[PDB]
Amino acid sequence: MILEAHYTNLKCRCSGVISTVVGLNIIDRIQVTPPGNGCPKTEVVIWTKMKKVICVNPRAKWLQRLLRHVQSKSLSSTPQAPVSKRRAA
To answer: Principal localization?
Structure first.
């Protein structure tokens, strides 16, 4: 997912808020809308790859996982080999 941060002032149209957990693979873009003058509320607009415009609340706990995941680019390595010595022929 591409995290967008916009400060462009306009009448922000996002259809309410929905707490439906959206599929991480189909999540195209998560755009944060700060509580602007032309915008009615603080709105997080999730576009999907299927081109459905989904609106979610900024206080959604499942969303907070994603917001705290996208600020972690440096993962831990894998020393743990998932392939041990298998049986011979």
So the answer is: secreted
Residues paired with 2 in a beta bridge: 29
Judge whether 11 and 38 are in contact, CB under 8 Å: yes
What experimental approach yielded this model? NMR
Count of domains forming the chain = 1
Task: Say how far apart CA 11 and CA 39 lie, in whole Å.
Answer: 5
Number of Cβ within 10 Å of residue 58's Cβ equals 16
- Residue 16 contacts by C-beta under 8 Å, 6 or more apart in sequence? 55
Q: Domain range for residue 11? A: 1-89
Residue 58, C-beta contacts closer than 8 angstroms, at least 6 positions apart? 32, 42, 43, 44
Evaluate whether 63 touches 42 at the Cβ level (below 8 Å): no
